[PDB]
């Protein structure tokens, strides 16, 4: 059998490729359905439940959304740093000034050091644009759409020579209650698609994942899409003999039935590459009605992005490749010895959105009126799950454990998945006490 032959002849099976936290063996296991498991949807009104509202947009509403974004972030930054007042962009001033705006490029290409512009807010600058000169700036990190506060010289009123870049400030963490400290140790498994090789329809990696889930019996399993990839060669050439919907239900039934004996809860997160679903961000939950009474207690459908409380632990779930988009259009002063991923993650956490980049990638549909109400970070998450096409990693940035397990299938060979332990320690201590105690990125 030539389909998935290279995958089926893998020898690296079961290998552990990354570990973080406290050293653990290979006998990773949960209690299954034992104990109390709390699964809650959190945040601005809860992570979208209905189908959607619209698919036509009004420019004077996008204008309002962008303006409000800038004003809110600027007001909070002004409160934190205790600055006196903001100066209009076009007003000449011989003394140093403090401007508030958002970063952008002056053309349709990639942003660089020479093409930076700053666009002001409506209240102060009435949406004016000025070039920014970064010759005299020592350390900086900039991407388009970043709401920023600069301090510099602007003598002529047509160009700003930036001299200081104020650092961003993140949101406060979640405040645990008395109940949340009484929860016991739990194990969580995380996987992201695609779940089949690029040359086959067999879905072998899915079966391997189901076998692993049955063996380990974790407490929660979070699965990201796509389940029917829109970029697959057979999908995009329309060689399939069945409707997309039927194939999707087939896959979903295979997943649900195969992990019935485990007793582990299942969470399904949609993707923008799901062919049968709506290709607009943010996405509503999947549609599935063929569930018995038993299965309604173990299967839960959430949106994208989502904020999920698992036993008093906050998880930030997003399927979009934000790391691969932000990193492709981000400029920085230091390139020799610096961590790109940590820097991008710091931008994500301090910008207070699930997608800070504006304008988005070329193939990325965003509805801003719903993006404003359904895609904001409520608090700084305890664990942030960010699947991406880059190499797998687990990093502790700003008190948040950011995990990238990668895709379950990469080209014609298998990928990786991730497992975590969670247990919240005692209330008092040295301020931050991460409820996540051990992470491991493992081969499939």
């Amino acid at each position: 059998a030539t389909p998935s032959q290279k995958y089926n002849s893998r020898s690296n099976r079961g290998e552990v490729v990354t570990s973080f936290g406290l050293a653990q063996g290979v006998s990773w296991s949960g209690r299954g359905g034992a104990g109390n498991i709390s699964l809650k949807v959190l945040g601005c009104p809860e992570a979208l439940t209905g189908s959607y509202k619209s698919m036509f947009q009004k420019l004077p509403d996008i204008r309002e959304v962008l303006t409000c974004k800038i004003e809110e972030l600027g007001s909070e930054l002004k409160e934190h740093y205790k600055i006196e007042a903001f100066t209009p962009l076009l007003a000449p001033a011989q003394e140093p000034v403090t401007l508030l705006g958002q970063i952008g490029c002056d053309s349709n290409g990639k942003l660089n050091n020479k093409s930076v512009i700053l666009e002001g807010d409506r209240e102060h600058s009435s949406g004016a644009q000025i070039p920014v000169d970064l010759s005299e700036l020592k350390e900086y990190s900039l991407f388009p759409g970043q709401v920023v506060i600069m301090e510099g010289i602007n003598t002529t009123g047509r160009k700003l020579v930036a001299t200081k870049l104020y650092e961003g400030v993140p949101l406060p963490f979640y405040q645990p209650t008395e109940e949340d400290a009484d929860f016991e140790q739990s194990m969580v498994l995380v996987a992201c698609g695609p779940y089949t090789t690029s040359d086959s329809i067999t879905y072998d990696p899915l079966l391997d994942l189901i076998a692993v889930i049955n063996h380990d019996r974790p407490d929660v399993c979070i699965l990201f899409g796509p389940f029917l990839d829109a970029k697959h060669e057979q999908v995009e050439n329309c060689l399939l003999t069945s409707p997309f919907e039927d194939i999707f239900k087939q896959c979903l039934r295979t997943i649900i039935e195969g992990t019935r004996s485990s007793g582990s809860h299942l969470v399904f997160v949609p993707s923008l590459r799901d062919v049968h679903h709506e290709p607009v961000y943010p996405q509503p939950p999947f549609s599935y009605s063929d569930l018995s009474r038993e299965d309604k207690k173990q299967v839960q459908f959430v949106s994208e992005p989502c904020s999920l409380s698992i036993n008093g632990v906050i998880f930030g779930l997003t399927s979009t490749d934000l790391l691969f988009h932000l990193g492709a259009e981000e400029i920085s002063s230091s390139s020799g010895t610096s961590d790109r991923f940590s820097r991008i993650l710091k931008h994500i956490l301090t910008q207070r959105s699930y997608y800070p980049l504006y304008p988005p990638q070329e193939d990325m549909a965003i509805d801003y009126e719903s993006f404003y109400v359904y895609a904001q970070l409520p608090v700084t998450p305890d664990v942030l799950i960010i699947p991406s096409e880059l190499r797998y990693f687990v990093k502790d940035v700003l008190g948040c454990v950011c995990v990238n397990p990668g895709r379950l299938t990469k080209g014609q060979v298998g990928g990786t998945f991730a497992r975590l332990y969670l247990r919240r320690p005692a209330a008092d201590g040295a301020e931050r006490q991460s409820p996540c105690i051990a992470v491991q990125v493992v081969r499939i």
């Binding site: 036509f56 420019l59 952008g104 002001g120 409506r122 644009q129 965003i366």
Partner: protein, 117 residues
């Protein structure tokens, strides 16, 4: 394509193409940042997207394409010849594909409650 957001200037000598929506608006719409006296306009409007989906629903609508025939005799002659009940069901499945996307989205819907009250 519609959600890409490409804006193009209205002046024939400027024709500035951009994906970034300026926050400076004139009376008609966004104000062009290259020539400061003009308005940007969508390259692919919502009316073009709406008309495109209405076209797909129209090339598979055998129900409306039969009442459009002039004589009642010809409509009977081919309804019994090609348009079997099995054939009519096939066109209904292709028609409903374009109708799902048109159902609740794109404001082909008009809300009278907001319009009058």
């Amino acid at each position: 394509k519609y959600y890409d957001g490409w804006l193009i200037c209205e002046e024939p000598t400027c024709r500035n193409r951009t994906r970034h929506l300026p926050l400076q608006f004139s009376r008609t719409g966004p104000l062009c940042p290259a020539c400061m006296k003009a308005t940007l306009q969508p390259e692919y409007s919502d009316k073009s997207l709406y008309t495109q989906l209405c076209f797909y629903r129209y090339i598979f609508d055998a129900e409306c394409a039969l009442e459009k025939l002039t004589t009642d005799h010809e409509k009977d002659k081919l309804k019994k010849q090609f348009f079997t009940p099995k054939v009519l069901q096939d066109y209904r499945k292709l028609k409903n594909t374009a109708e799902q996307f048109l159902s609740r989205s794109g404001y082909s819907e008009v809300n009278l409650s907001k319009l009058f009250a």
